[PDB]
DNA ligase 4
Amino acid sequence: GASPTEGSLTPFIHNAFKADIQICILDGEMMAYNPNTQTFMQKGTKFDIKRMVEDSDLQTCYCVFDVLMVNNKKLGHETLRKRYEILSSIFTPIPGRIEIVQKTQAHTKNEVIDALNEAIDKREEGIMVKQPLSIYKPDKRGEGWLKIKP
DNA sequence: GACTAGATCAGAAGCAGTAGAGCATGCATAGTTTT
């Protein structure tokens, strides 16, 4: 949906943005949410989030992890911490339709292994790590973002 | 996931052939009238 009147995810989150924010760019991941369990349907069997069938009870959820512009302010060159803080003041999350990915501060390896073990326990792919001072470099790989899997 | 292509079956329309009905033409004969 390109307008609040008609869409599959936008008609519900039109009014989820604080009044001050008028121009806003966000980056995130789109996934499928099962409400009867209140759990995210892991990608794979029984559904594709690209061409979901209307009759299905599953719905679309947007998990945000970055902001690149708010009220004609260019946040590309700022540090990750600042972008996170500004992101916290964009929308009031409304579970099931738009959310912010939680990030935990960690400064030891035991924490990383604990997180990976817990992720495997919750049947997730893995865990990723972000450098607090990393800048957004479009199209580049392995600059401030790292991923870890079993 | 959305979309299309090819195979399959049935339904319906067109055409062929037959049977049944109706309408002209003749004439065969008898009946009636005239001389």
